[PDB]
Design a protein around this ligand. Structure first.
Ligand SMILES: *CCC1=C(C)C(=O)N/C1=C\c1[nH]c(/C=C2\N=C(C[C@H]3NC(=O)C([C@H](*)C)=C3C)C(C)=C2CCC(=O)O)c(CCC(=O)O)c1C
Ligand SMILES: *CCC1=C(C)C(=O)N/C1=C\c1[nH]c(/C=C2\N=C(C[C@H]3NC(=O)C([C@H](*)C)=C3C)C(C)=C2CCC(=O)O)c(CCC(=O)O)c1C
Ligand SMILES: *[C@@H](C)[C@H]1/C(=C/C2=NC(=C\c3[nH]c(C[C@H]4NC(=O)C(C=C)=C4C)c(C)c3CCC(=O)O)/C(CCC(=O)O)=C2C)NC(=O)[C@@H]1C
Ligand SMILES: *[C@@H](C)[C@H]1/C(=C/C2=NC(=C\c3[nH]c(C[C@H]4NC(=O)C(C=C)=C4C)c(C)c3CCC(=O)O)/C(CCC(=O)O)=C2C)NC(=O)[C@@H]1C
Ligand SMILES: *[C@@H](C)[C@H]1/C(=C/C2=NC(=C\c3[nH]c(C[C@H]4NC(=O)C(C=C)=C4C)c(C)c3CCC(=O)O)/C(CCC(=O)O)=C2C)NC(=O)[C@@H]1C
Ligand SMILES: *[C@@H](C)[C@H]1/C(=C/C2=NC(=C\c3[nH]c(C[C@H]4NC(=O)C(C=C)=C4C)c(C)c3CCC(=O)O)/C(CCC(=O)O)=C2C)NC(=O)[C@@H]1C
Ligand SMILES: *[C@H](C)[C@H]1/C(=C/C2=NC(=C\c3[nH]c(C[C@H]4NC(=O)C(C=C)=C4C)c(C)c3CCC(=O)O)/C(CCC(=O)O)=C2C)NC(=O)[C@@H]1C
Ligand SMILES: *[C@H](C)[C@H]1/C(=C/C2=NC(=C\c3[nH]c(C[C@H]4NC(=O)C(C=C)=C4C)c(C)c3CCC(=O)O)/C(CCC(=O)O)=C2C)NC(=O)[C@@H]1C
Lengths: 64, 174, 64, 173
């Protein structure tokens, strides 16, 4: 059932084959540069983006 | 694999790399292109959502007038949030190669909720159709401002698949 | 002196005159809807955006 | 907000209510100023990405091997610095002065960039575009997004923030 709690799967994909590693970020076993992360997070309200869309909805962006 | 995350009380993150990720990419079709496809959605989630909601409004600007579905920033923000929620469940469907969780945790009861609150179905239908169009545009190198940083090739099968997940949403909310 | 620690003043401006309040966000005294927050934060690397610029730098955006 | 910055404490300061009403008396055009700071920080990502992109598109050698932003780390570090600089400029505009920008961002920066091979021409193009973009928002000359403000004249604040960017340009020329 849809729980009404705003929580959704937040998927993150990583391709780090240049070998640039940020400290603290090794969370699974591997040395080929690839990782997938999934968490369940409440998706927040974004007042700034709501303000912007309310003002700017009538502008065609990105050659759409 | 990530199913524990969907059901955990607090949804703390799970990670898959190395040999476990090698295995994962074998159980879904076109694993490498599929990961690029999921990355395209989540890396661009903000613009996908804002462009789609903006287009629903520019086609029907009574939605932001009094009595309109996204009048006031509170409602606008709630709509942008929902569109991101839906997009994120679609992203997870494409990662996993199936729609069980989208159907169960996102769509089950959602129409009934929108009908109780008075969320306009015609607006919802247009927001979804634009998100669908935008995601497929990215995956098929038809996005005009930004292209994906991938090896060149054909992703048409993944475009059709993600389109089918969006169609599950459109059908549920019709 | 520039401390070479990547830290910069991160300013956030809040206009909540519409009366929409989020639980757990009242951090100052006032009822007029206005607030300014400032903190010093290390500015992080965004590999996804670096990748995007590397691919997309030659497309003019935003009527620029 | 000097406490926040003077110490590396890392803690946030908040000001609202009559306190913020008073603080806005100590800088000119308080309300338009807060709109101007908000425009900078709300659009920080796109201001930075458009300015660094413009850098590269006028000198695409910068992303060839041996170029200033070849590899993702070097590009990412450059985007990071551009955002650091923009944020110190946003703080100068909030406070009406450039003391912190000078002491904590510019002081020693020319010499660091000389050591590390961060090219001055590229920095100059990125700063000029960030300056143009920020002034564009504040003056209703941005084309894809407009601010949600009353219509009016913000030319004085545009000239003030332009002067902050010019302090950066002069330091790094
Ligand atoms: C994520 C932002 C983005 C980048 C970056 C990029 O390169 N393309 C991007 C977005 C994108 N949008 C579409 C399709 C549509 N967008 C809209 C809404 C806008 N049109 C309006 O009339 C309107 C108000 C004035 C808008 C705002 C619409 C209607 C579409 C078409 C939807 C449809 O059913 O086809 C795409 C798809 C590719 C394209 O260029 O059309 C993309 C990639
Ligand atoms: C934050 C993104 C944005 C929105 C949204 C908006 O409405 N305007 C936005 C950005 C913006 N950019 C400029 C000005 C310039 N941008 C560039 C870089 C691009 N030009 C290229 O040739 C290129 C490589 C192909 C780019 C990438 C440049 C060079 C400028 C001009 C700088 C100058 O000296 O004048 C502005 C200012 C207003 C405008 O439309 O030009 C804004 C608001
Ligand atoms: C209602 C759903 C709105 C909405 C409100 C949100 N505000 C969020 C963060 C936030 N807001 C303020 C300003 C507020 N706090 C005060 O102390 C005062 C004045 C004395 C005011 C006017 C602050 C300081 C903060 C951040 C708190 C901190 O940095 O510690 C917020 C974020 C919650 C989250 O990210 O999960 C929300 C949702 N947002 C909307 O879209 C509608 C219109
Ligand atoms: C439609 C989606 C795109 C398109 C995508 C392609 N990707 C191709 C190969 C490829 N992608 C990755 C990275 C990916 N794999 C991972 O495990 C993760 C992170 C966990 C990521 C982000 C890899 C490793 C590969 C193999 C090739 C390589 O590394 O160079 C690809 C070539 C075909 C194929 O291998 O199936 C395509 C076409 N390309 C397009 O033009 C549209 C826009
Ligand atoms: C070097 C400075 C790069 C850079 C790298 C960053 N990665 C960040 C987050 C991150 N990366 C991974 C993948 C890595 N961890 C693993 O366990 C595996 C394989 C088993 C790999 C390939 C993960 C999982 C994470 C998130 C860490 C977590 O969720 O706890 C990261 C932080 C991003 C931020 O602070 O916003 C960085 C900086 N980024 C760059 O731009 C250069 C090119
Ligand atoms: C260039 C800056 C802009 C321009 C901005 C204007 N803002 C005006 C009045 C105004 N703005 C606010 C919000 C502001 N004050 C705060 O304390 C905070 C949050 C902490 C913010 C975001 C207020 C409260 C006001 C006064 C009440 C109102 O007018 O709604 C304004 C009118 C002139 C003046 O009051 O000085 C202007 C012109 N307008 C433009 O067209 C460019 C893009
Ligand atoms: C945007 C394209 C729509 C629009 C959306 C609105 N939804 C509103 C409230 C709302 N939405 C949900 C479903 C959401 N919560 C979840 O947990 C999940 C899935 C896990 C989803 C997709 C709920 C439960 C609620 C009410 C409870 C809450 O917000 O926490 C909403 C506010 C409506 C109102 O208050 O009258 C809006 C505006 N509205 C539109 O016009 C366009 C078409
Ligand atoms: C972008 C428009 C440039 C570009 C910039 C690069 N900067 C690089 C490294 C770097 N930058 C700083 C200064 C920065 N750190 C701070 O703490 C503050 C202010 C508080 C500033 C503005 C430092 C100290 C460093 C080296 C240490 C680090 O990376 O944390 C950089 C990488 C150089 C290297 O790896 O040695 C680049 C590419 N490069 C360009 O070509 C355009 C013009």
């Amino acid at each position: 059932a849809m729980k009404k709690d705003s929580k959704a799967p937040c998927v993150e994909v990583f391709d780090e084959r240049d070998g640039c590693k940020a400290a603290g970020t090794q969370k699974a076993s591997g040395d080929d540069g690839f990782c997938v992360k999934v968490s369940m997070k409440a998706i927040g309200f974004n007042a700034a983006e709501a303000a912007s869309v309310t003002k700017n909805y009538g502008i065609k962006r990105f050659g759409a | 694999a990530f199913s524990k995350v969907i059901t955990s009380a607090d949804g703390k993150a799970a990670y898959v790399g190395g040999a476990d990720l090698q295995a994962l990419k074998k159980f879904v079709s076109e694993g490498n292109k599929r990961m690029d496809s999921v990355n395209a959605i989540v890396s661009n989630a903000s613009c996908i959502v804002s462009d789609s909601v903006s287009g629903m409004v520019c086609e029907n600007p009574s939605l932001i007038a009094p009595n309109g579905g996204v009048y006031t920033n509170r409602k606008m923000a709630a709509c942008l949030r929902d569109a991101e929620i839906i997009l994120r469940y679609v992203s997870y469907s494409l990662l996993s190669g199936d729609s069980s969780v989208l159907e169960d945790r996102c769509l089950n009861g959602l129409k009934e909720t929108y009908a109780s609150l008075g969320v306009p179905a015609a607006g919802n239908a247009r927001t979804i159709s634009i998100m669908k169009a935008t995601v497929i545009g990215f995956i098929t190198n038809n996005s005009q401002q930004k292209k994906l940083s991938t090896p060149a090739g054909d992703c048409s099968a993944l475009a059709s698949e993600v389109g089918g997940y969006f169609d599950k949403v459109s059908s549920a909310l019709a």
